[PDB]
Design a protein around this nucleic acid. Structure first.
Ligand SMILES: [K+]
Ligand SMILES: [K+]
Ligand SMILES: [K+]
Ligand SMILES: [K+]
Ligand SMILES: [K+]
Ligand SMILES: [K+]
Ligand SMILES: [K+]
Ligand SMILES: [K+]
Ligand SMILES: [K+]
Ligand SMILES: [K+]
Ligand SMILES: [K+]
Ligand SMILES: [Mg+2]
Ligand SMILES: [Mg+2]
Ligand SMILES: [Mg+2]
Ligand SMILES: [Mg+2]
Ligand SMILES: [Mg+2]
Ligand SMILES: [Mg+2]
Ligand SMILES: [Mg+2]
Ligand SMILES: [Mg+2]
Ligand SMILES: [Mg+2]
Ligand SMILES: [Mg+2]
Ligand SMILES: [Mg+2]
Ligand SMILES: [Mg+2]
Ligand SMILES: [Mg+2]
Ligand SMILES: [Mg+2]
Ligand SMILES: [Mg+2]
Ligand SMILES: [Mg+2]
Ligand SMILES: [Mg+2]
Ligand SMILES: [Mg+2]
Ligand SMILES: [Mg+2]
Ligand SMILES: [Mg+2]
Ligand SMILES: [Mg+2]
Ligand SMILES: [Mg+2]
Ligand SMILES: [Mg+2]
Ligand SMILES: [Mg+2]
Ligand SMILES: [Mg+2]
Ligand SMILES: [Mg+2]
Ligand SMILES: [Mg+2]
Ligand SMILES: [Mg+2]
Ligand SMILES: [Mg+2]
Ligand SMILES: [Mg+2]
Ligand SMILES: [Mg+2]
Ligand SMILES: [Mg+2]
Ligand SMILES: [Mg+2]
Ligand SMILES: [Mg+2]
Ligand SMILES: [Mg+2]
Ligand SMILES: [Mg+2]
Ligand SMILES: [Mg+2]
Ligand SMILES: [Mg+2]
Ligand SMILES: [Mg+2]
Ligand SMILES: [Mg+2]
Ligand SMILES: [Mg+2]
Ligand SMILES: [Mg+2]
Ligand SMILES: [Mg+2]
Ligand SMILES: [Mg+2]
Ligand SMILES: [Mg+2]
Ligand SMILES: [Mg+2]
Ligand SMILES: [Mg+2]
Ligand SMILES: [Mg+2]
Lengths: 53, 235
RNA sequence: AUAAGAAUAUGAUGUUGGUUCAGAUUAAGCGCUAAAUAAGGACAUGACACAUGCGAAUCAUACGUUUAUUAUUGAUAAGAUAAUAAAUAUGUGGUGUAAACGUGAGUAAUUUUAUUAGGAAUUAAUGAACUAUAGAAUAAGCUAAAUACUUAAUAUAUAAAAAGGAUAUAUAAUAUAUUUAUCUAUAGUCAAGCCAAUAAUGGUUUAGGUAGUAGGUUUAUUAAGAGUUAAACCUAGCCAACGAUCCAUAAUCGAUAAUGAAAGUUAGAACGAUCACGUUGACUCUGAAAUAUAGUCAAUAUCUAUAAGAUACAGCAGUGAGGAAUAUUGGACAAUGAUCGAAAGAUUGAUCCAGUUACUUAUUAGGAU
RNA sequence: GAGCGUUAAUCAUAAUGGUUUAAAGGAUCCGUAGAAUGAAUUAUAUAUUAUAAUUUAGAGUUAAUAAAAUUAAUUAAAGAAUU
RNA sequence: GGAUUAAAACUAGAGUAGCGAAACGGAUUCGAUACCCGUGUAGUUCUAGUAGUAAACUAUGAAUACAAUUAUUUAUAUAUAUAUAUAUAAAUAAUAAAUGAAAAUGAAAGUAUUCCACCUGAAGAGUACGUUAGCAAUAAUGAAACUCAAAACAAUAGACGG
RNA sequence: ACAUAUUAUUAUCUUAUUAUUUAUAUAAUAUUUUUUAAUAAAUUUAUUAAUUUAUAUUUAUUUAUAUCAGAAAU
């Protein structure tokens, strides 16, 4: 018998799916939004570079 | 993984669900340039209270269970401690029975000796009446009684000789038979080994298959097993 | 891998045995002496007391407030409205000070340090503040007004939110567009809480210690285990001559410094890591995290404004004291960072430089005849 | 040598030691712990250790035979001499 | 940790011839709180205890493996042409080797292994203080400061010796 | 001996503050609630001030426990 209130087995290792990690962390813009603004364009370029990196 | 240790249970039954386990680990002592064993006693959780003092157990790290308890019993490698408890209980019953039987065999022996001390008749005198009545023809009722004191219904010269037999006599004949067997076994094997042809035949006669193709030790044992199967089984 | 001994006993000899010396070094002081330059350091003592000036501000594009001009209105000029250009940070607001810097008092470890390819309770509806993506941003009240605060609406058992400002254009205050903010959700990044194993000075002329003490059960509390805290009920344990308990002393450590052939020993100034503290003690608030250099009360000292007041230089410089002994009441935000701001920019005794001082190192300090 | 000396300190400079007679064998033995040490063969294992089986050279038990009359405790006696 | 532990000493009850601290006398002597003599108390003896100290010494902890000889005893065994002879151990004595400062050790003080106790200049000091134990005397445990460059052992040649 | 200073402890005494926990109010505020005046608007309704009613949030006093600190003893 293992101690009462304790887990008999060790917690399961968490394996990372790189495809899912990329999908949740750096997901692509869902629509091709209209970045006519000067600041929107700069932000779009920065977001693209960060996602590529 | 969780840190596991091996240790000997050194205390049990003093705390509820807790045992003390002695863990020895190997360390190097730089000062004396020697690899030493370092000992420490661990308070260990025993959920099922199965472990007993003397058992060899493996303890596994767990969550904090108390101020000083951080390990639990994970497996009983050897259960010598549990065996001790079982053998002690059985011993009390086993010894009581034997002592009772021996006490009854002592009182019986005492009674027999006391009964014999109540019979003034003595072996010498009784054997002097069975040898005078058998040489004179008189048959006083004492003889009939003597035929009951000893069970010797018939009074002949070959009945007093069987009343006075000593165990030593039997031992002397058993010893001669024992000596004969050993001497015969040795002479038989000694002769067999001296003659390889008679040896090969000997093995085949007793049921060996191609004894010729055998080693000295692999075949001398067969000869010894056979010589001791031809002088101890037939007798 | 790199390992040297010498002097001193004795009448003399051999040996035992201590003492001293030969080497290197410093967080050094002192005596005598002293040229320039470059670089590295500088209160080890009283966590003693501190005159004076500085070390934390910033935003006017959150809300108010104040001018000037022009136009319209006001049949006489007090005011109003809009545009433009300025002012206001002694009004309400936002962000910033849990960092950095300084110090080493406490701390010998239920707490601190170091280490491990350690662990679970199998750690919160925590983002602190940037990144990627998606969505939202509603109604009243209170204040003079608001991106202040309060109460509601709607948003992943479901719970739990918000905020506008600036600038254009079109409309009749509204709508878009640009720009900068606000809230929520998911992941990442950074960053947290807890536990185990091992090691960490001296004294037993401190030998017995412990009574929540050791273990079990249950509830409260917490994101979370556990006599961690509080409450209840049981068992009689737990530590200890391989040194318990107690007492004294001390911040710890390194790929740092010193020394040695090396194992080691020493230091813990300087460089870096960690801990603790900001006159003393306790407590509370906010928050993911604080017994916070905050607040509250008390203690000690000082001060002026005499208030249920302010201050506490272990921030920089500096002064007195102590001591054998350790420096400028310097310059600059040019560089590297940090905070505020949409930006323009503002601030910065962090920092960068210089000054003082042979404290250390290095170079130079005239060659041929 | 722009230092030199001196004081205060640190490291190194002999345990690749000793205890009859020079510092140092505990009065003696028994025996607990020892994180002290300790036989043989073979087979496994994760290996100078563990486990299992097996063995008799250390250490013991019981007899047989021979030998010895001591050492403890207790009780009962003797002897020379002395006053 | 435990047990045992000379002599002296101590606590009780006996005993007390001889011996004999002390004490009191006699001598000796410059003096004689001594050596010698006398009277001689405790003690020396026994029983029941306390205490755990000695130059308690072989000044040498215990155990195991091993190494060259002789002599002399002792024990066991063997043999005979019966009283010796031949073997294997123990003890003791003198040694080889080895060790050691040497004196010497000699089956250890040699070659090795295992465990325990103990030592780190002299003096201060086995003292002070504390603690523990004891009826007590005491026993165990056990420092530091100050001072010094000493202190000690074996051996050598002398000098000296009532 | 002892006179001092420092620290620690407590079956003791006093205790700031705080946390938790009691009891109380003709306590305050908001809402609800029962009525009652005054006022106002319109021609019943609203507002204000009271009373009743519960509810939540506070406030004052109070009970108990713990607590900086000081006193006393050791
Ligand atoms: K528990
Ligand atoms: K010397
Ligand atoms: K702004
Ligand atoms: K400072
Ligand atoms: K410190
Ligand atoms: K906007
Ligand atoms: K200690
Ligand atoms: K700057
Ligand atoms: K010696
Ligand atoms: K006498
Ligand atoms: K010994
Ligand atoms: Mg020197
Ligand atoms: Mg110098
Ligand atoms: Mg400089
Ligand atoms: Mg200082
Ligand atoms: Mg404005
Ligand atoms: Mg303001
Ligand atoms: Mg800080
Ligand atoms: Mg803050
Ligand atoms: Mg600095
Ligand atoms: Mg809105
Ligand atoms: Mg509003
Ligand atoms: Mg707000
Ligand atoms: Mg003392
Ligand atoms: Mg506790
Ligand atoms: Mg619990
Ligand atoms: Mg309790
Ligand atoms: Mg300190
Ligand atoms: Mg160190
Ligand atoms: Mg240190
Ligand atoms: Mg410094
Ligand atoms: Mg603090
Ligand atoms: Mg403080
Ligand atoms: Mg404060
Ligand atoms: Mg200060
Ligand atoms: Mg300063
Ligand atoms: Mg001075
Ligand atoms: Mg200096
Ligand atoms: Mg000056
Ligand atoms: Mg400045
Ligand atoms: Mg130089
Ligand atoms: Mg050395
Ligand atoms: Mg020795
Ligand atoms: Mg001895
Ligand atoms: Mg001795
Ligand atoms: Mg034997
Ligand atoms: Mg004697
Ligand atoms: Mg007597
Ligand atoms: Mg006299
Ligand atoms: Mg006289
Ligand atoms: Mg006399
Ligand atoms: Mg005795
Ligand atoms: Mg003595
Ligand atoms: Mg002695
Ligand atoms: Mg003797
Ligand atoms: Mg023995
Ligand atoms: Mg003594
Ligand atoms: Mg001598
Ligand atoms: Mg207190």
């Amino acid at each position: 018998k293992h101690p009462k209130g304790s887990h008999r087995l060790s917690p399961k290792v968490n394996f990372i799916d790189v495809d899912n990690l990329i999908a949740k962390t750096v997901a692509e813009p869902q629509s091709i939004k209209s970045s006519n603004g000067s600041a929107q364009k700069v932000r779009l370029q920065k977001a693209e570079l960060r996602r590529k990196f | 993984a969780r840190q596991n240790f091996l240790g000997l249970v050194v205390s049990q039954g003093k705390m509820q669900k807790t045992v003390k386990v002695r863990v020895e680990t190997k360390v190097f002592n730089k000062k004396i340039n020697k690899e030493l064993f370092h000992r420490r006693d661990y308070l260990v959780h025993d959920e099922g209270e199965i472990s007993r003092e003397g058992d060899l157990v493996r303890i596994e790290a767990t969550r904090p269970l108390s101020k000083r308890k951080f390990f639990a019993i994970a497996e009983i490698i050897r259960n010598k401690g549990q065996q001790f408890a079982l053998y002690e209980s059985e011993a009390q019953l086993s010894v009581a029975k034997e002592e009772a039987q021996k006490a009854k065999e002592f009182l019986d022996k005492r009674s027999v000796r006391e009964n014999k001390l109540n019979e003034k008749t003595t072996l010498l005198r009784d054997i002097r009446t069975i040898q005078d009545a058998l040489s004179s023809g008189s048959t006083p009722k004492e003889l009939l009684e003597i035929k009951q004191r000893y069970g010797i219904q018939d009074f002949s010269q070959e009945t007093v000789r069987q009343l006075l037999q000593l165990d030593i006599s039997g031992l002397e004949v058993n010893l001669e038979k024992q000596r004969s067997l050993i001497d015969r076994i040795q002479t038989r094997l000694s002769e067999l080994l001296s003659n390889d042809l008679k040896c090969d035949q000997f093995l085949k006669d007793h049921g060996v298959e191609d004894p010729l193709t055998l080693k000295k030790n692999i075949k001398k044992n067969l000869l010894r097993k056979h010589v001791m199967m031809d002088m101890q089984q037939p007798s």
